[PDB]
């Protein structure tokens, strides 16, 4: 009936500051049904807001891995 956009909070690992995890998500700002990606690296974590009828965690680490890093889906 219904899609409704969420955002997921999580840990990267690999990235040397510098652009880097910013690098890594505004990858994943290329993918259909991402909107925003906001990296957190004052808490080594990045934010991402994505619709899950298209986009999410399934698709992301997926492409993460072509970024050339790997995300952690810790915390919840």
């Given at each position: 009936m219904l899609s409704e956009q969420k955002e997921i909070a999580m840990q990267v690992s690999g990235m040397t500051c510098a652009a880097c995890a910013a690098r890594i998500e505004k990858g994943l700002k290329r993918m259909p049904g991402v909107t925003d990606a906001n990296v957190n690296l004052a808490t080594e974590t990045v934010n991402v807001i994505y619709d899950?009828?298209?986009?999410g965690t399934a698709a992301i680490q997926e492409k993460i891995e072509k970024l050339g890093y790997h995300v952690v889906i810790e915390g919840r």
């Open positions: 899950p009828a298209e986009t």
